[PDB]
Amino acid sequence: EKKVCQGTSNKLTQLGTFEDHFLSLQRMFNNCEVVLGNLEITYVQRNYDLSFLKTIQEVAGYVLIALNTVERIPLENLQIIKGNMYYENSYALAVLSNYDANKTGLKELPMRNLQEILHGAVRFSNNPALCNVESIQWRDIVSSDFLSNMSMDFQNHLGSCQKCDPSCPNGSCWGAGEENCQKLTKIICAQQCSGRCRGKSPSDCCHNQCAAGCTGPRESDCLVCRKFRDEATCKDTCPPLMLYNPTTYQMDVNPEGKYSFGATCVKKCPRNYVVTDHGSCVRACGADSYEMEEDGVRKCKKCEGPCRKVCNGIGIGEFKDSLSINATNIKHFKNCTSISGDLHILPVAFRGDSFTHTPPLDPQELDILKTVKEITGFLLIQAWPENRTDLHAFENLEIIRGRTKQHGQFSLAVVSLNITSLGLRSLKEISDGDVIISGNKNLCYANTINWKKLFGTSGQKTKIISNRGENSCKATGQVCHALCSPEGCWGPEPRDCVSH
Amino acid sequence: VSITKCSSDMNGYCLHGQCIYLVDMSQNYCRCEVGYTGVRCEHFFLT
Ligand SMILES: *[C@@H]1O[C@H](CO)[C@@H](O[C@@H]2O[C@H](CO)[C@@H](O[C@@H]3O[C@H](CO)[C@@H](O)[C@H](O[C@H]4O[C@H](CO)[C@@H](O)[C@H](O)[C@@H]4O)[C@@H]3O)[C@H](O)[C@H]2NC(C)=O)[C@H](O)[C@H]1NC(C)=O
Ligand SMILES: *[C@@H]1O[C@H](CO)[C@@H](O[C@@H]2O[C@H](CO)[C@@H](O)[C@H](O)[C@H]2NC(C)=O)[C@H](O)[C@H]1NC(C)=O
């Protein structure tokens, strides 16, 4: 029931003008409490209300605050940054150059609740108007294994900052007022404590699983969970489905057993994910292991010899920082049937990229993908051979499972192509996520398909817009074949028909 | 005194955007067309 958002990875890049940028930022992080990716507050101009930031309480990746001329950023309730990802490969918090060219800008950063950085260091630089932040002692918040990587050159030229309230211990505070004082949960802790704590008393020693702190030494009284969160209890690892019996020497069923999903212990994996024997919800099985359904459960199984090739998708593995299917990595998809991950086909594949040493891609080399029948993540096509009329390489594709989705939403996206028909005539299931079919100035048959017949989840919606207009296609006789009245078609020809 | 224009070597770096040099970090970056996202402005954004 915790409100959840994807975060952004734009890393100091600007989306449109400062208005457009603010609008995208606000749409992203509106009423969000847990950010699964990075929290990137950049380019927010003075007199812009950042009230929605008051809701975010946890960040899994890194937090970036840069080039804002806004006066205040109210991350009042940010409790923890897990640091699952670094800015510049050593920072879970990077605040950097928040000022306008007329010597003004960000001054109020009242992160009064930030009490834990699980992984990473923090870096502050070139915040001239920034008030009161040269006061915070970070030895308490950051882990000791990262203290050397901090690089934070706290100076200000404004100097018109109200001193920290005399009530704040050691003069350390995030803003003005007796409410913005720093709370110590590690440094002030007693010697007998395991880790975090509420005070120097041994009574206030918090459970080792409490990340920010606690309101009581029990497991369920933590402020944030360090590892896994089972219901309302912080757990080092999810309770297994079976427990060993030291007396009988055999395995017995655990009634409190749970499946590991993300950082949570759930009673059941999600519909389109896989299940390992360990009782854990996975996005893919290791090499020399295959996916299969057996009694209402999708699960991994080992293969004694003959099983499918491990084809990772654009984004993961050998395709780590790749933007698209391109001439370099096309050959690695020669004999793929299942794509373990996502597929991107961007315009730069076709134009070639000089900055990644990538030559142009031969359109005739695309037909390699005709062997592919299953994609487990999302399929994103923003470029296609302009001389090609349909998506011919995917004529044998049957299922898009949508485990990972673009922006956490889209499992099928076909945008801005010269195609006239989709030609996805073997498509039978889209297990999760939304479809977006946009900007294809010549496409004419996407309307005839009842896309709710492919969907495996309620609330899966489509966005079929800005293509060749319906009445346009009907006016030029570019409609489904007569023998194919029931569910439409993917093209003019009788085989392109879904039901014939 | 914050951003500046990019060099002539930076041409097809931004896929749908304009290059911008950030002098505090000494780093190059992008400013995307409306409706495009990513460090290099590579992906069409939902709205
Ligand atoms: C076309 O396909 C090919 C094949 O997939 C693809 O080539 C890959 O490009 C990426 C990006 O250039 C390479 O990944 C790099 O790996 C090195 C380590 O060897 C890293 O140093 C790189 O950057 C890191 O450090 C940066 C410091 O600022 C970080 O910002 C960054 O996030 C990284 O941490 C980067 O990871 C990859 O090795 C190649 N692979 C091959 C086989 O060539 C190419 O990019 C594709 N074309 C396009 C346009 O994407
Ligand atoms: C961040 O901390 C790491 C770990 O202490 C240090 O990086 C050193 O160099 C490489 C690159 O990470 C490591 O393999 C070494 O083990 C690290 N220590 C030494 C003595 O070489 C370094 O303190 C910091 N890294 C940077 C880039 O500043």
Ligand SMILES: *[C@@H]1O[C@H](CO)[C@@H](O)[C@H](O)[C@H]1NC(C)=O
């Ligand atoms: C796009 O498709 C139309 C369909 O007839 C064709 O006339 C046009 O030449 C195509 N564009 C390119 C660049 O091939």
